[PDB]
Amino acid sequence: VYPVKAFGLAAKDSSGLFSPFNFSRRATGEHDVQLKVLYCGTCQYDREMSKNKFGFTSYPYVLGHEIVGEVTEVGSKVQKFKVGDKVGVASIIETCGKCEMCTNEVENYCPEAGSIDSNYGACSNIAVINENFVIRWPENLPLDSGVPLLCAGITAYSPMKRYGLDKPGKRIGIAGLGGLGHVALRFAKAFGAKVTVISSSLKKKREAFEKFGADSFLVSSNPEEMQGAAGTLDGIIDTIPGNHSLEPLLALLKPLGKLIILGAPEMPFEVPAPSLLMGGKVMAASTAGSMKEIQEMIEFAAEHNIVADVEVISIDYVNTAMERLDNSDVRYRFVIDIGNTLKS
Amino acid sequence: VYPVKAFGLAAKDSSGLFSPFNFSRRATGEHDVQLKVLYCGTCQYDREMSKNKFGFTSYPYVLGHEIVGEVTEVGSKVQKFKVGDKVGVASIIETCGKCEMCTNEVENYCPEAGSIDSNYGACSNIAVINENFVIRWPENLPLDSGVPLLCAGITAYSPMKRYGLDKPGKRIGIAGLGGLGHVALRFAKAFGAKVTVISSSLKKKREAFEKFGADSFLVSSNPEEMQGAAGTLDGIIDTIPGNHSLEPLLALLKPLGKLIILGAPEMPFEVPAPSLLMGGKVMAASTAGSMKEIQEMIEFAAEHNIVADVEVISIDYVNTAMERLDNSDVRYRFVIDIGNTLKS
Ligand SMILES: NC(=O)c1ccc[n+]([C@@H]2O[C@H](COP(=O)([O-])OP(=O)(O)OC[C@H]3O[C@@H](n4cnc5c(N)ncnc54)[C@H](OP(=O)(O)O)[C@@H]3O)[C@@H](O)[C@H]2O)c1
Ligand SMILES: NC(=O)c1ccc[n+]([C@@H]2O[C@H](COP(=O)([O-])OP(=O)(O)OC[C@H]3O[C@@H](n4cnc5c(N)ncnc54)[C@H](OP(=O)(O)O)[C@@H]3O)[C@@H](O)[C@H]2O)c1
Ligand SMILES: [Zn+2]
Ligand SMILES: [Zn+2]
Ligand SMILES: [Zn+2]
Ligand SMILES: [Zn+2]
């Protein structure tokens, strides 16, 4: 219904099959930033959403919730951005502005928070975003390998800060060395933690040590390895997207330790009361992060040279990438090269 | 195997029936406090243990993990306590002293923590306790109505402080208005919270308002009442000992809110990931509390005149009281008058 021509990829139904899709964006309002999309990260969440895993997908579904681009126009009241600036946008682009969560700068938890993909995401030529939901991209962070910071980076960083899993010398587990996990690992290392990777096989063992500097690696299907590490970890970041038990993770925690649940399985977790009571353990979940947190995160990543390991793909490759995500078959995030491959 | 004659009540088997039982206590060592027991609180945990609910009861089981008494002998190196002092003892009376939890003054989480009831509890004439696990009893706290502070009071206070559910103006739910719950409620009120009681029926509604000053009362099995309170609570103290879902409690929490699980059911909790992810909620369990926390708790209770509502009973009534615990049929804790009713 709007004046600015847009084009990208959309799924028509819960098959999740993407196709070229024409749509539109609002004209640039007084407080808006229009940007040419350069790179669009993608991830398991897009695959899950495209197939309506969570039951809340609206079709047609235009993916794209982690973008970097260059400003093409700003509204008359925008001061902070100018034409040509490199900018990033994460998954939340509107909130109520007036509730407790919004006023306390944790607006990602606004009960009326609006996601970028809810009104056509930004695997597209252009995006138009209120200036309060855009960041200036740091000059020392690559655009292609940095874009997943707007999804994986913030999602890890926010709870790591909130729950105190950001201290040197503590022992932090990362469950699932995937898209989100490899970034969480890099943050934990930069905070000075000793990192244990908890993985479903030995395939990523060498990577964990030689790519990531893990201190130890546990295969979750090896009972002796898991048992040997009982009660050793201060915290665990659980990234696993598929059905799994929390009991083995809780067993790895010290008393008072914290399990942070980021992944979103369809099957509910079965949690015996003693698995928490014995040792007074904590389970917390977390989603995304606030704009204040994203700004802190991106400055921290720039200072510590934290980026993702990315496979840069074309628009035409997206359905292949989606199929590869069904076995997490990427090292470690797909990034779509919009600027060079989306046809105009 | 020890020299000092002791006598009290013990259960022989998982019927949970208590009978007179003779046993012994160690002589008073250099750092020990011998005390004559004056009041022994009892509670659902004693009923549960007496019937082996958790599978770890060793018979004979001498109940009594919350006591107030009077010092009768002190060891040669004891300075803090003197003969005749009124003192309190909670459930943990020995720890390893050298692990991370012990050295950080959270020794109730010592993996080798020793409960008072594990080596014959103190529903008995005499107890002998290392001085580091005894507190001086405040003169302005009644012995009879105060003794449950050493079980219910600490169990509520410790996580309320640890997880920040101790701030004025916050909205705190108490699930299950029983032995533990009524004390937790009183602490919440003293911290300046607005309290919502979540209960299994209307039966305790008048008590909640008139006796406890609750701000609202929700029947958990009334969907309209529960739905009307969605997203309103900063935290919940869940005391429920029987099978229940956490989903309705999580739904009452605001984003970032905290559910504290204190009670201990047989059936595991089923927790859908979205029940935590939506709003970034926290579920923490907790057990007992540390000696440092007990001292702070008892000073807070003395300052704010926090006591339990108790029914003082004789030794001869204990089995009848235990039966009444099966339906929580007490307002709100039984306290055994050892000094006046345990026969010499
Ligand atoms: N909370 C938030 O705000 C937020 C934001 C973004 C994404 N997410 C969610 O986070 C989840 C993970 O996303 P991601 O991009 O990291 O996915 P991913 O790239 O597929 O990585 C997940 C990793 O988990 C492990 N794994 C996968 N399926 C498993 C299973 N069934 N059992 C055990 N381990 C399994 C694998 O690690 P190993 O090979 O080491 O075993 C895999 O590499 C998704 O559910 C997504 O929706 C949440
Ligand atoms: N974590 C710790 O360190 C610790 C320490 C002490 C005790 N505990 C545990 O805490 C639990 C509660 O102890 P308590 O002394 O408060 O017991 P209680 O005096 O029997 O009170 C429990 C209350 O929970 C509610 N309730 C009971 N059964 C229920 C069911 N099946 N479904 C729903 N609500 C139910 C009732 O409240 P309404 O009538 O309002 O519905 C009842 O009054 C026990 O499991 C005990 O072992 C734990
Ligand atoms: Zn993403
Ligand atoms: Zn809001
Ligand atoms: Zn008790
Ligand atoms: Zn210890």
SS3 letters across A164-230: CCCCCCCEEEEECCCHHHHHHHHHHHHHCCEEEEEECCCCCHHHHHHCCCCCEEEECCCHHHHHHCC
Binding site feature residues of A for Zn(2+): 43, 65-66, 96, 99, 102, 110, 151
What are the phi and psi torsion angles at B282 (to 5°)? Answer: -120, 135
Determination approach: X-ray
Cα A99 to chain centroid distance, Å, stands at: 25
DSSP string for A79-105: -S--TT-EEEE-SEEE--SSSHHHHTT
Amino acid (one-letter) located at B221: S
CATH number at B152-308 = 3.40.50.720
Dihedrals phi, psi of A276, to nearest 5 degrees? -95, -45
Q: How many CB atoms lie within 10 A of CB B97?
A: 11
Nearest to A111 among B159, B231, B271 (CB): B231
In whole angstroms, give the CA distance from residue B316 to residue A343: 88
Q: How far apart are CA A135 and CA A193, in angstroms?
A: 28
Measure the CA–CA gap between B236 and B216, rounded to whole angstroms: 14
Residue pair A240/A263 in contact (Cβ under 8 Å)? The answer is yes
Query: Cβ distance B192 to B168 under 8 Å?
Result: yes
Pairing of strands B171-175, B92-94: unpaired
Q: Are A18 and A318 in contact (CB under 8 A)?
A: yes
Task: Give the C-alpha separation, A250 to A271, whole Å.
Answer: 10
According to DSSP, residue A329 is labeled -
Tokens 């719950």 map to which residue? B181
Picking from B100, B101, B269, the nearest residue to A271 by CB comes out as B269
Cα separation, A64 vs A121, whole angstroms: 5
Map chain B to HEC letters: CCCEEEEEEEECCCCCCEEEEEEEECCCCCCEEEEEEEEEECCHHHHHHHCCCCCCCCCCECCCCCEEEEEEEECCCCCCCCCCCEEEECCEEECCCCCHHHHCCCHHHCCCCEEHHHHCCCCECEEEEEHHHCEECCCCCCHHHHHHHHCHHHHHHHHHHHCCCCCCCCEEEEECCCHHHHHHHHHHHHCCCEEEEEECCCCCHHHHHHHCCCCEEEECCCHHHHHHCCCCEEEEEECCCCCCCCHHHHHHEEEEEEEEECCCCCCCEEECHHHHHCCCCEEEECCCCCHHHHHHHHHHHHHHCCCCCEEEECHHHHHHHHHHHCCCCCCCEEEEEHHHHCCC
Helix (H, G, I), strand (E, B) or coil at A73: strand
Resolution of the experimental structure, in angstroms:
1.0
- Rounded to 10 deg, the angle between the A291-304 and A179-191 helix axes is 70
Burial class (CB in 10 A: 0-12, 13-18, 19+), A115: middle
Q: Where in chain B is the domain with CATH 3.90.180.10?
A: 1-151+309-344
Q: d(Cα A279, Cα B228) in Å, to the nearest integer?
A: 34
CATH topology (fold) of B1-151+309-344: Quinone Oxidoreductase; Chain A, domain 1 (3.90.180)
Cα B94 from Cα A318, distance rounded (Å): 61
Q: Tell me how far the alpha carbon of residue A149 is from its chain's centroid.
A: 7
**What is the rounded distance in angstroms from the CA atom of residue B11 to the CA atom of residue A108?**
54
If phi over 0 gives left and psi between -120 and 50 gives alpha, with beta otherwise, what is residue B288? left
Task: Look at strands B233-238 and A233-238 and give their pairing.
Answer: unpaired
CA distance B34 to chain A (A): 30
| Residues with a beta carbon under 5 angstroms from ion ligand 5 | B 43, 45, 66, 151
Residues of B in contact with A109 (CB under 8 A): 255-256, 279-280
Q: Which residues line ligand 1 (CB under 6 A)?
A: A 43-45, 48, 151, 155, 176-181, 199-200, 204, 239-244, 262-264, 286-288, 325, 328; B 277
Distance CA B197, CA A206 (A): 53
Q: Which two tokens stand for residue B60?
A: 């004979």
Q: Would you tell me how many other CB atoms lie within 10 Å of the CB of residue B162?
A: 19
DSSP H or E run through A6: strand A4-11
Residue A265 C-beta-side C-alpha neighbours within 13 Å: 15
Backbone phi, then psi, for A214, in 5-degree steps? Answer: -60, 150
Q: Is A56 on the interface with B (CB under 8 A)?
A: no
CB A133 within 8 A of CB A114: no
- Chain A residues whose CB is inside 8 A of the B265 CB are 273
CB A151, CB A43: distance < 8 Å: yes
- Verify whether the Cβ–Cβ distance B277 to A286 is below 8 Å: yes
- Contact yes or no for A284 and B287 at CB 8 A: no
CA proximity to B73, closest of B83, B86, B63: B83
Q: Do A37 and A55 touch, CB atoms closer than 8 A?
A: no
Separation between Cα atoms, residue B315 and residue B337, nearest integer Å? 7
Numbered ranges of CATH 3.40.50.720 in chain B:
152-308
Query: B319-337 burial by CB neighbour count: b if 16+ within 10 A, else e?
Result: eebbebbeebebebbbbbb
Phi, psi of B159 (to 5 degrees): -70, -30
